[PDB]
Design a protein around this ligand. Structure first.
Ligand SMILES: Nc1ncnc2c1ncn2[C@@H]1O[C@H](COP(=O)(O)OP(=O)(O)OP(=O)(O)O)[C@@H](O)[C@H]1O
Ligand SMILES: [Mg+2]
Lengths: 97, 49, 49, 49
């Protein structure tokens, strides 16, 4: 931050980049939450092993000596669901979605 | 008519110093200070102000 | 793929699939969609939810 | 901090008559005549000043 009058170095800011709506949105709360876990239930679980399990139990991955997955690619015909899925799993972890 | 214009710009980030970084439409980005009519609830990053 | 008359209109279509009902909640939309055939429309508009 | 901002120019051209065309970082170029602290021996092209 600088004083505009004379270009004086006032106080060093936060580097904070330019995230506006971009990253700021965190929604994971209802409608879609962890009482919408009716599926397609193996497909939801796969997400949990990949994602929640290294977050919550990060140490199991050391014991075995692997890395956790880098991503869970959900795809399918529309409406069947994958908006579903992603949001419930996020709500359970409660992290930076 | 002689009352002045007020500058529209869009909120880049929120500073936790009581300040708001606003990326103005001017071209520069300005660090500006809140007023009593400003509150965190109605601000968002993406807030025209 | 490898067109611009039927590529670009598909990446604004992919945006729609996905904004009209997507991530974002609800509100009060209720989007009234209107069309002349359902025989040259994407299967996501065609289905309910 | 209050000191008049010493704007940066890059010796974009030079002349043997005292004048040195500095492309200023504002955008435009200026032709300015250098002080007695700095000399035209010190001013080579590519020299930020
Ligand atoms: N298994 C499910 N049970 C109930 N509701 C579901 C289920 N799967 C999806 N839905 C709901 O169906 C509605 C419409 O589907 P949505 O657009 O969310 O899906 P998608 O397969 O991720 O889509 P697109 O391909 O269009 O991006 C939503 O309200 C969503 O929560
Ligand atoms: Mg979807």
């Amino acid at each position: 931050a600088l004083n505009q009058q004379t270009l004086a170095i006032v106080n060093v800011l936060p580097t904070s980049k330019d995230p506006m709506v971009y990253g700021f949105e965190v929604e994971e709360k209802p409608e879609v939450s962890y009482e919408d876990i009716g599926g397609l239930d193996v497909q939801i679980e796969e997400i949990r092993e990949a994602v929640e399990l290294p977050l919550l139990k990060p140490e199991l991955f050391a014991e075995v000596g692997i890395e956790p997955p880098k991503g869970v690619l959900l795809y399918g015909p529309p409406g069947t669901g994958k908006t579903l899925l992603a949001k419930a799993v996020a709500n359970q972890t409660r992290a930076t979605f | 008519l002689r009352s002045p214009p007020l500058l529209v710009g869009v909120v880049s980030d929120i500073l936790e110093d009581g300040r708001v970084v606003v990326k103005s439409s001017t071209g520069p980005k300005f660090v500006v200070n809140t007023s009593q009519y400003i509150n965190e609830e109605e601000l968002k990053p993406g807030a025209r102000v | 793929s490898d067109t611009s008359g039927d590529r670009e209109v598909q990446r604004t279509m992919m945006q729609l699939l996905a904004e009209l009902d997507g991530f974002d909640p609800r509100g009060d939309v209720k989007v009234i969609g209107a069309t002349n055939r359902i025989d040259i429309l994407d299967p996501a508009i065609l289905r309910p939810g």
